[PDB]
Amino acid sequence: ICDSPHQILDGENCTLIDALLGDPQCDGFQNKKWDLFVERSKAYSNCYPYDVPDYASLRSLVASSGTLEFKNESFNWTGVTQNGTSSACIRGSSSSFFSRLNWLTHLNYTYPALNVTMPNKEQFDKLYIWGVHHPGSSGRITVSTKRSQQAVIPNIGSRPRIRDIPSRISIYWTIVKPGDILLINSTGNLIAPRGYFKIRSKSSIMRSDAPIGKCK
Amino acid sequence: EIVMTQSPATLSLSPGERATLSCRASGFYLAWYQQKPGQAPRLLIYDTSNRATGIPARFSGRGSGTDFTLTINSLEPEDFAVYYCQQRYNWPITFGQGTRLEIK
Amino acid sequence: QVQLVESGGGVVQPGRSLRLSCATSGFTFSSYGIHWVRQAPGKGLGWVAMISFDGSKTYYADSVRGRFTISRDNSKNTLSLQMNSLRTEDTAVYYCAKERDRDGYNEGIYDYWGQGTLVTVSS
């Protein structure tokens, strides 16, 4: 793998999606920009269990963007607190969680319909990543735009402990073009997004296992 | 519980050749298990792409989207056995119906 | 070193009560969650039962749901899979397998096994 002509990123233990989420052990890759992404077979995650029902398209899109360029946008989420600490996903000496998502639960044991809205003012497309926290008793989620309703229903049900946390953080993606206005509604446990990732128009991704070296 | 399928029940290959194993189920936690005929199975893989203790690096797991795969870059006589793909998301753990590697 | 032995298998008429015992040695029995796995002659494996960690929970499989009563006594380090209402689909070897982490942290990963006891049901 040559370095001089094209920008490579490698990654000890980060799958491209894990760097996208900002897993605590892969947090060093924030805001990184690349031309080609390269993936170790050692890749593993230490946070909450998770699953992207459209893994392939998300991988291709993020790789083609060639940038994370995250920017916190200060969504309202005023009704309840946006931080959440899990026994897994340890980062440091205490509990932690993804660095690009929220684990809302609901303060005062009540979850009002949040009805969050965020206008996409910029001239370039934006991508917002959110999830649904399948527990292990009530709640429905919907991410609405001018083109789709990414309806999701929390698939409640018991499950096997995977990292001492019997649940899932199923992750979806949402494009929000200029002029369109993201709309979000909820009734229960929602993995509230923290901010968009920019998209930039010939980068790609290759799953090579060659060593790392400095050469042309 | 998911209905986990696997590659054809028997794949015949000569030692040293490259092999691939499929476990299309329709993303994570699909540990594989190795059993030698007349022996209690043993762990080979503990996640879609991570190897357990002692396994040679020749075995490599990849794939995602309920379309996982296990590619063997070079077979060895000890590799000709039965391989079952597990799954941990949801309570009922459903091993695949299994497949056999035979010395061609 | 840790080792597992299955016992109590054999021949029993359908519907008769049966109880395997899987003892353990080389480790404190509360250190792991126990399991049971089966395979009929010539078929693929299948799941049977489970105790999560320290015996406050149990979760069986579909085809055998409700029939069995897996239980343990932490003061003697002994496992048992109490069996009721055996049926002709239950001809297979029964392994008692452990997992690769303590107290329950990755449940669903097995590294240690016994030899496997044979249980046969027929006239």
Author numbering:
A (entry chain A): 51 to 186, 198 to 262, 264 to 278
B (entry chain L): 1 to 26, 30 to 107
C (entry chain H): 1 to 52, 52A, 53 to 82, 82A, 82B, 82C, 83 to 100, 100A, ...
What does the paper say about this structure?
Among the influenza A viruses, the A/H3N2 strain is of particular importance due to its higher rate of antigenic drift than the A/H1N1 strain and associated lower vaccine effectiveness. To better understand how different vaccine platforms affect antibody clonal compositions and their respective quantities and qualities in the serum response, in this study we aimed to comprehensively profile the sequence identity, abundance, and binding affinity of H3/HA-specific circulating antibodies that comprise the polyclonal IgG serological repertoire in three vaccine cohorts who received either RIV4, eIIV4, or ccIIV4 during the 2018–19 influenza season. Interestingly, even though we detected multiple antibodies with stereotypical HA binding features in day 7 peripheral B cells, only two near stereotypical monoclonal antibodies, UT14 and M47 (a stereotypical trimer interface monoclonal antibody), were detected in the serum of two of the 15 individuals analysed.
However, UT14 has a nine amino acid-long CDRK3, as opposed to a ten amino acid-long CDRK3 seen in other antibodies of this class.19 In addition to detecting the UT14 CDRH3 peptide that defines the lineage in the serum, we also detected by LC-MS/MS unique tryptic peptides that contain the Asn-Trp-Pro region from the CDRK3 region, further confirming its serological relevance. Biolayer interferometry competition assays revealed that UT14 does not compete with anchor nor stem monoclonal antibodies; however, it competes with known trimer interface monoclonal antibodies.14,20–22 The higher binding affinity of UT14 Fab towards monomeric HA than trimeric HA indicates that the UT14 epitope could be less readily accessible in trimeric HA. We further obtained a 3·8Å resolution cryo-electron microscopy structure of UT14 with HA, revealing that this antibody buries 808Å2 lateral surface on the H3 head at the interface between two H3 protomers of the trimer (appendix pp 22–24). UT14 utilises its light chain extensively for HA recognition, a feature that distinguishes UT14 and the murine FL-1066 from the human FluA-20, H2214, and S5V2–29-monoclonal antibodies, and faces the HA in a similar orientation with FL-1066. Unlike the Asn-Trp-Pro motif critical for binding to the anchor epitope, P95 in the Asn-Trp-Pro residues of UT14 CDRK3 does not interact with the HA. Instead, CDRK3 residues, including R91 and Y92, along with the N93 and W94, engage in epitope contact. Lastly, we report on UT14, a highly abundant monoclonal antibody, that has nearly all stereotypical features of membrane-proximal anchor antibodies reported by Guthmiller and colleagues, although it differs by having a nine amino acid-long CDRK3 instead of a canonical ten amino acid-long CDRK3.19 A closer inspection revealed that one more conserved proline adjacent to Asn-Trp-Pro (ie, Asn-Trp-Pro-Pro) is likely an essential feature of the anchor stereotype (Guthmiller JJ, personal communication).
